[PDB]
Amino acid sequence: QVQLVQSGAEVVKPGASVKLSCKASGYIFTSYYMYWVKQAPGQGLEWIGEINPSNGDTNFNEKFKSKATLTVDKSASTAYMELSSLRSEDTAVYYCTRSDGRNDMDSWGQGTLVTVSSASTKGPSVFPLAPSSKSTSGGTAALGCLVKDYFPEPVTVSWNSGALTSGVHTFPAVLQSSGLYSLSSVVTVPSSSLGTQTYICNVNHKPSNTKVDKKVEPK
Amino acid sequence: QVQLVQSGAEVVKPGASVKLSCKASGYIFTSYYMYWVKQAPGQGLEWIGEINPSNGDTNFNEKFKSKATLTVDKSASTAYMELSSLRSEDTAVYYCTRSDGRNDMDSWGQGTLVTVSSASTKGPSVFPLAPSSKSTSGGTAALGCLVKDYFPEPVTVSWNSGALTSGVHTFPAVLQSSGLYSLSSVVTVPSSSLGTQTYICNVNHKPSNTKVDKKVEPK
Amino acid sequence: QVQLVQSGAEVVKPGASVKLSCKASGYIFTSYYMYWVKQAPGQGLEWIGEINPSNGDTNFNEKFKSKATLTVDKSASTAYMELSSLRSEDTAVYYCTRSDGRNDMDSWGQGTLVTVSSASTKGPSVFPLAPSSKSTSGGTAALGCLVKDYFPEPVTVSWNSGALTSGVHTFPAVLQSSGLYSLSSVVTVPSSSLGTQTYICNVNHKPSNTKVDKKVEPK
Amino acid sequence: DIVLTQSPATLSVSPGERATISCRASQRVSSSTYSYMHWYQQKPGQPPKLLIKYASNLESGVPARFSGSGSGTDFTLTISSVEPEDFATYYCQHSWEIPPTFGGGTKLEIKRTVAAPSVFIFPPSDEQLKSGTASVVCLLNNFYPREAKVQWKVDNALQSGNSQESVTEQDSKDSTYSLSSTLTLSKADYEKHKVYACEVTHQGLSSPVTKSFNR
Amino acid sequence: DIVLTQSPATLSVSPGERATISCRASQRVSSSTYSYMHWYQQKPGQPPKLLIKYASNLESGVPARFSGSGSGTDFTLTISSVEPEDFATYYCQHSWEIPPTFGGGTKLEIKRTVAAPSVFIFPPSDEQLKSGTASVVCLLNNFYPREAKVQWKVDNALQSGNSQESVTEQDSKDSTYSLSSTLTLSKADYEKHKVYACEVTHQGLSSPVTKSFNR
Amino acid sequence: DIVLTQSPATLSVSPGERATISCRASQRVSSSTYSYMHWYQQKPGQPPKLLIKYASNLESGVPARFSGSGSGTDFTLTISSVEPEDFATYYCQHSWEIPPTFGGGTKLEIKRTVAAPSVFIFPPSDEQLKSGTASVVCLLNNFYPREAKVQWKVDNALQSGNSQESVTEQDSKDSTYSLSSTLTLSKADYEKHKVYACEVTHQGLSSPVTKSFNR
Amino acid sequence: NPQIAAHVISEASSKTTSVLQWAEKGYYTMSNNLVTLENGKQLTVKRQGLYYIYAQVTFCSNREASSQAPFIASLCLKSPGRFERILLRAANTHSSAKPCGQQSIHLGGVFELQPGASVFVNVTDPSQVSHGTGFTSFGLLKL
Amino acid sequence: NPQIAAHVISEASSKTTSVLQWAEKGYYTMSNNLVTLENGKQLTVKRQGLYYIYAQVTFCSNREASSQAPFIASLCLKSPGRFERILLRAANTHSSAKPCGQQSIHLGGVFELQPGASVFVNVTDPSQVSHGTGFTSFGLLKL
Amino acid sequence: NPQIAAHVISEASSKTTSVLQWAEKGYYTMSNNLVTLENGKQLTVKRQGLYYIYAQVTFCSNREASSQAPFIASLCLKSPGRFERILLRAANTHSSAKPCGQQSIHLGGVFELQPGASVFVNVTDPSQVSHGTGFTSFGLLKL
Ligand SMILES: [Zn+2]
Ligand SMILES: [Zn+2]
Ligand SMILES: [Zn+2]
């Protein structure tokens, strides 16, 4: 199988520099130009540059001539990207991909999430988004947790330690101003339930060992 | 006098490699492209390649790009050819010659006999080719020696240690299958002679210290 | 102020070699091709060559390809010219000058007087050029000193240690055959003066410490 | 740089429905023998997968429904009859020069009948106010299409400075969206007003449903 | 590669006879001012000697009889009146491109009236059979021209597998050839048959002279 | 090499007088937008100072009187009204190719009415004869123009071998020349003759003034 | 009247040949079918004639890397019913510049082509010619 | 009938650009106003068409001196109403030769120009291209 | 109507000059007597006019061997009643590659020739220009 295995995700403070690696396999390394594509949150697919691995020879998208530094270890069948002087808008997923004759790009690495921020690891804050007449359309009631200010992603959220998995809609994180993320996990249950039934959300922020179990109650 | 003096003959087993030399003189060495020509038994004149001696620069006949390696010692006003991985069809005489503006080839070295075979030095075998009714046309009788299987050339053959030099026809050697050569030296004498006259052939195979004196008698 | 300061004057025996320098300043050194111009006694302005100082790169006027050697010390913002195997006709003033886009030559060093002769330092000889009927047109008499055979220039000449500076015409030196120079300093005074007035010329040949005070008298 | 413009940005088709996206070069990128256009499909979380190269040849492995045509500046990519797996987002991309550049993308959404959203407004967790921050979350559950305006209004003062929306991918069950608009004031500002209201506009809704509450 | 074909392959001339050989390029090798053809004569045992360069100019030292002409693809070399020393073999060779290539050669043989050969057949030296090898030599003495067929026949079985011929250069006395065809059987095979016979055909002979013998 | 010929060689103008020198290229040196000609003035003892570049643009700092025109092979440089500082010698020089080359130069002399020279002849300093050398100096004082023939004649024998002239720059007072011709004999030759005479010709002199003396 | 010319752009390729590929993309030239780029390997002409033929080739390599011998490039012609043949050839010696140091090569020359004629650039190691925009091109124009 | 061609000579310049200057001096060529050398920076054409474009550039430098990366030269085209663009480019790796070692560069190629089109040679460090007579030139001819 | 063009092949020579020889052999070009290769040294033209002139030159040498200064090649022109003159020039710096490392050179450019005009390639040390097929050529075509 022809495969490209990119390196682990990286969290780095602005101005720093990171060196992404990509290990090809399943084909003759030097016979393909290895490209690099950046895709930023919501932002599209952008071509950074190209490197012939046989050569060491490169070619960049002017728009990135400064940020990147393509290089390869012919022996280890591996390419490497070095982004430097990272601003905040440098955050995204960097893909290494095999160009087929420098035209169709036919195989891609998993991708590498390079997130550059000044913030520093931190658990989230959880807040009940408790049911109330103001959140009870018809026979159904809405309720859930607000997992505020943590960093970096991901904060996994579960309800009633697994049992409750119906009606849950746990939203995608959204970098609020300041430097931390804030997502809200919500679930709709029958109103008539709030009485005989209890509910707890289980926020877990491994990147900080953080873990909380907010018992959402109908305040 | 403008002259080129090639090196001594070389006998080598297949697969080996030999390095021919050619020492020019009588002219400005660097001002003439030195060529190299191969001429194989019966086979024609073949141009191997050229070398500018001032340069080191070379040019080969594709047909030989593999076999040869032209080089020169500007100082010693000498050129060298290195044939490698010698097959049997590599046997021939290698000439070094001065090209005049790389057009007419106006001066040649003696030539070098490169003979490549698995056979190994050996004296010949001699056999009378005795007169008989079957070899007596009219008043004359034919008779001579058969110098079989020896290597490498040459096997010189003489009659009655010199005295007999009339009517002798000593044939050119012919590499029979197997690896050795076999020539026959013959002489026609008056039939009426076989009685009062005696005849002896003197094969001499220096390359083996070999020497035989076959008294050909009319068996 | 953009300026170029050439080196001291040089007196050298034929065949020798001299190395002229020129120190620019007042502008970016490497952004101007530095030329070199020779101008010989009476002889005109001749371009010797050019050097890009950023480069080291040069370009000579064929007519001088042999005599000159342009070179520069980017760091010391300085150029150098080395004239070698000096013949006598090599004597003249060598100017270093900044070319403006290699077209108009817009700034020049003081100039360097390279005088190449076999002669050797020596004081002059002084001779009265005394008034006589043969030198007394009308009411006026002519008289002066002949400062003969000295080397190298300059021989300064003054009258009555300064006081006398009217009517003096001290001629330019002229390299007579042989190797030395010979100039004559003259002055016209009223004839009627010769009696009540005295006159002395003051030859001073620093290059030899020489100094003489010839009292010109009407012999 | 050449600029490719895809369209529609969202194509909502049902499985069994045929779908064809179109791409667009700011200049011709097809010469006398080939058109230097390629298409990729990309799933959430994953990198693009090559489907068609040089405008019309299926990459190896791509299923036959996938096909593509075009030339010069316009190209299309079309699945003959959509299959669940096919739902994804597609990019067309050239290779006419350096730098290669990708199209905007087209999401191949799942058609499904409209559905009005059910909104619910949550006021500041008392516990969260004990932290100087007051953020009010409004929530539109299980709606479709995805187009949904959600304006905020504090004490009749039409918010407009800062609020943050976040959405979910079509539901694996009803193929419907759910968005979450979160107004966020300073405990101060919050304690400073009476009525907070998130007002949502959406095709389903016969008209703008407002959802308010007072401290 | 350019291919030069000379002709005749053998030119038999007599001293005092004028001879002219011709060469042939598989393509033109003469342009607007020069023809890149040269001729060499080569004696047995020695390397070529340059006679004429650029189709028509005598090399320095070559005697005036030697001359040459031609252009494009056909060239000639001609001695104005053959002299003993001139008998040799001649090659034409270009220099139009790499690799320079030589013509097949033309032997400048000595004309002399036909002469039938006198054949003689020698059967296996008893001493040589004491070695497991039996070789029978047949000999055509002093004949001319050099064209001479010599078929072998064992027990009426027309040999055809293996026999080896060797020849001599024109005799220094009569300018005539002498060839030696040597059939060679295994002591076994030899002892296996009765009559061995070499049959020679040649202009001189009014007819095929056969020479046989029986063990 | 291109050859520039200036003219006049000497231009005698008075302050307040307008003067225009002209240069000449052995070939055009002006192409479609520029003329690669430049002018320099050069004072005694000093190096050239750029006045005009590209035939017609004043170098920075050059005063506006200075101006220049022309194209192809002919160019001029002209001071609108000469000022004392202006008197010098001017060179035109191209930059059409390597090597740039200068014109012969033109001296911008000071006009001033003619003035006959007053000659004076000095015979061998007795003290100088005590050195084997006898050199006789002839002197033309304060004359103008600068053109002045000065032939030497020993014992009626019109000298012609060796004598050396030296001149002075226009006087700072009367703007007039003064030259010094120095015949030089060997104490021997000198003592060998009777009359030595330097004869000068010049516009001023209604006729050749001879000045002689006898040992 | 009909101008025949062609400028084609270098194109890297996994294929195995020392013969370079070319693509009719970027700012290229192909005045008409009187000249045609086939197989992405050669340019073929339908009209006999004189033509000015060229190929610009820059490559990036190392002294010791491939080291070996130089990097020669050759403009080859293949006329109908004739064996191949070389028209021009340029050759440099690998620089040291790590990872690789680029070097350019240029060859033109007027030739007469037989109708059906076709040319192709061939180099010693295509795995290292440079393909950055504007680096390696190939083309011909008829007089 | 009207031949349009132009050969201009390299001209050193104190200005600050990587774009090289050219002068209509020495043994140059400028067939007419159908081609004009403006700003001493580029050659502009008034007639649409195919043109053979070239620039010969030799320079003098050092390995470590500027060292850095190679010396790339580029033939640029600027057509009306279009952003610039690169047509060709050559690039060598600084020699060691002290003070500097010259090296030459050459790029042609046939292109079709829009009327009003205009081209310019641009290099990495003009401070070191060579200007001795005959070394650096630039020019174009229309077919 | 009459095309005037000429491609001639390099020819080594024992003679003593820095002016390179040429032969009208191999796959060469010489459209007619309107252009003629005389003395095997230059190309002379009979018709005044513009011409695109070129000379490809590859050579093989060493750093220290001849070492000295670079290897410069020059396209010279000799018009009737005029002194010689240099039109183009290229120049590299001897490689180290033992015994010698080849390196190529190329110079074109359009010029206007006076009738009777004649051009020649001249180098610093012919004893080392390369002659292998396809390496060193010289030629011109009239527009
Ligand atoms: Zn593929
Ligand atoms: Zn010869
Ligand atoms: Zn200036």
The pair of structure tokens assigned to H41 is: 């920076």
Closest approach of I132 to chain E, Cα-based (Å): 8
- A10: CA distance to ligand 1 center in Å? 30
Is residue H46 less than 8 Å (CB to CB) from chain G? no
- B65: CA distance to ligand 2 center in Å? 27
- F59: CA distance to ligand 3 center in Å? 6
Inter-chain residue contact E98 with I24, CB threshold 8 Å: no
The pair of structure tokens assigned to D202 is: 């959406």
Inter-chain residue contact B106 with E59, CB threshold 8 Å: yes
Instruction: Name every chain B residue with its beta carbon within 8 A of the beta carbon of E38.
Output: 103-105
Structural contact between residues G11 and G130, judged by C-beta atoms closer than 8 angstroms: no
- B106: CA distance to ligand 2 center in Å? 5
Q: Which of the following CATH numbers is that of domain I1-143: 1.20.1050.10, 1.10.10.10, 3.40.309.10, 2.60.120.40?
A: 2.60.120.40
Structural contact between residues E100 and E1, judged by C-beta atoms closer than 8 angstroms: no
Is residue C65 less than 8 Å (CB to CB) from chain H? no
Topology of domain D113-215, CATH: Immunoglobulin-like (2.60.40)
Whether the bond into A154 is cis, omega within 30 of 0 = yes
Task: Tell me F30's DSSP state.
Answer: B
Interface probe, candidates E30, E32, E60, E101, chain I, greatest I C-beta count within 10 A: E32
Is residue H6 less than 8 Å (CB to CB) from chain I? yes
Beta bridge partners of C72: C79
Closest approach of G68 to chain D, Cα-based (Å): 32
Instruction: Name every chain D residue with its beta carbon within 8 A of the beta carbon of G28.
Output: 31
Closest approach of C87 to chain F, Cα-based (Å): 22
- B100: CA distance to ligand 2 center in Å? 5
Nearest CB among H24, H26, H27 relative to F32 is that of H24
The pair of structure tokens assigned to A128 is: 């009940």
Do the domains spanning F1-112 and F113-215 agree at the CATH topology level? yes
For chain A, give every domain's residue range.
Answer: 1-112, 113-219
Is residue G132 less than 8 Å (CB to CB) from chain D? yes
- Concatenate the DSSP letters of all residues of C113-132 into one string: EEEE-S---B--EEEEE---
Inter-chain residue contact B55 with I102, CB threshold 8 Å: no
- Check contact A-H (3+ Cβ pairs < 8 Å): no
Is residue G133 less than 8 Å (CB to CB) from chain D? yes
- G121: CA distance to ligand 1 center in Å? 25
Is residue I66 less than 8 Å (CB to CB) from chain G? no
- B100: CA distance to ligand 1 center in Å? 56
Closest approach of B127 to chain E, Cα-based (Å): 6
**Torsion angles phi and psi, residue I127, rounded to 5:** -50, -5
**Cα distance between residue A62 and residue A45, in whole Å:** 15
**Cα distance between residue G129 and residue G12, in whole Å:** 8
Whether the bond into D47 is cis, omega within 30 of 0 = no
Query: Which residues are close to ligand 2, an ion, with C-beta < 5 A?
Result: B 100, 106
First and final C-alpha spacing in chain E: 54
Closest approach of D96 to chain G, Cα-based (Å): 6
- Concatenate the DSSP letters of all residues of F77-127 into one string: EEESS--GGG-SEEEEEE-SSSSP-B---EEEEEP---B--EEEEE---HH
Question: Nearest-CA residue of chain I relative to H134?
Answer: I88
* D172 Cβ contact list (under 8 Å, min separation 6): none
Grouping H, G, I as helix, E, B as strand and the rest as coil, residue D17 is: coil
* C181 Cβ contact list (under 8 Å, min separation 6): C124, C149, C150, C151, C152, C153, C155, C173, C174, C175
Position C93, amino acid = V
Instruction: Name every chain I residue with its beta carbon within 8 A of the beta carbon of H58.
Output: 89-91
Whether the bond into C14 is cis, omega within 30 of 0 = no
C117-127 residues labelled b (16+ CB within 10 A) or e (exposed):
bebeebbbbbb
* F121 Cβ contact list (under 8 Å, min separation 6): C134, C135, F136, F137, F138, F139, F196, F197, F198, F211, F212, F213
Task: Tell me C194's DSSP state.
Answer: H
**Cα distance between residue B37 and residue B39, in whole Å:** 7
Beta bridge partners of C71: C80
**Cα distance between residue H36 and residue B174, in whole Å:** 80
For chain G, give every domain's residue range.
Answer: 1-143
Grouping H, G, I as helix, E, B as strand and the rest as coil, residue E127 is: helix
Topology of domain E1-112, CATH: Immunoglobulin-like (2.60.40)
Inter-chain residue contact I70 with H27, CB threshold 8 Å: no
Structural contact between residues I140 and I51, judged by C-beta atoms closer than 8 angstroms: yes
Grouping H, G, I as helix, E, B as strand and the rest as coil, residue C89 is: helix
Inter-chain residue contact I56 with G143, CB threshold 8 Å: no
- Exposed / middle / buried, residue C49 (Cβ in 10 Å: 0-12, 13-18, 19+): buried
Q: What is the CB neighbour count within 10 angstroms for residue A25?
A: 12
- I15: CA distance to ligand 2 center in Å? 12
Inter-chain residue contact H30 with F33, CB threshold 8 Å: no
* B167 Cβ contact list (under 8 Å, min separation 6): B187, B188, B189
**Cα distance between residue F157 and residue F151, in whole Å:** 11
Interface probe, candidates H103, H107, H123, chain G, greatest G C-beta count within 10 A: H107
N residues, chain A: 219
The pair of structure tokens assigned to A180 is: 């931390």
Q: What is the CB neighbour count within 10 angstroms for residue D193?
A: 15
**Cα distance between residue G61 and residue A56, in whole Å:** 8
- G123 closest CA partner among G101, G97, G103: G103
Structural contact between residues I50 and I143, judged by C-beta atoms closer than 8 angstroms: yes
∠ CA D57-D61-D67, rounded to 5°: 35
**Cα distance between residue C87 and residue E113, in whole Å:** 84
Is residue G111 less than 8 Å (CB to CB) from chain D? no
Nearest CB among I26, I30, I132 relative to E32 is that of I30
Structural contact between residues D50 and D38, judged by C-beta atoms closer than 8 angstroms: yes
> Which residue is listed with tokens 């010199």?
B162
**Cα distance between residue D208 and residue D214, in whole Å:** 19
Instruction: Name every chain B residue with its beta carbon within 8 A of the beta carbon of E141.
Output: 142, 169, 186, 188
Do the domains spanning B1-112 and B113-219 agree at the CATH topology level? yes
Grouping H, G, I as helix, E, B as strand and the rest as coil, residue B63 is: helix
Query: Which residues are close to ligand 3, an ion, with C-beta < 5 A?
Result: C 100, 106
**Torsion angles phi and psi, residue B61, rounded to 5:** -90, 120
Nearest CB among D33, D36, D97 relative to G133 is that of D97
- Check contact F-C (3+ Cβ pairs < 8 Å): yes
Cα distances (Å, whole numbers) of residue A172 to A41, A156, A157, A183, D124: 12, 11, 11, 6, 20
Instruction: Name every chain G residue with its beta carbon within 8 A of the beta carbon of D35.
Output: none
Q: Return the percent helix, strand and coil in chain F, to nearest 5.
A: 5, 45, 45
First and final C-alpha spacing in chain G: 10
* C206 Cβ contact list (under 8 Å, min separation 6): C154, C156
97-156 in chain B: CB under 8 A from chain I: 100-102
For chain E, give every domain's residue range.
Answer: 1-112, 113-215
CATH of domain C113-219: 2.60.40.10
* G107 Cβ contact list (under 8 Å, min separation 6): G54, G55, G73, G75, G88, G89, G90, I56, I104, I106
Structural contact between residues D175 and D112, judged by C-beta atoms closer than 8 angstroms: yes
**Cα distance between residue I31 and residue D48, in whole Å:** 58
- Check contact H-B (3+ Cβ pairs < 8 Å): no
- Write down the experimental method used for this entry: X-ray
Task: Tell me E172's DSSP state.
Answer: T
- A100: CA distance to ligand 1 center in Å? 5
Position F213, amino acid = F
**Cα distance between residue F110 and residue H121, in whole Å:** 52
CATH of domain A1-112: 2.60.40.10
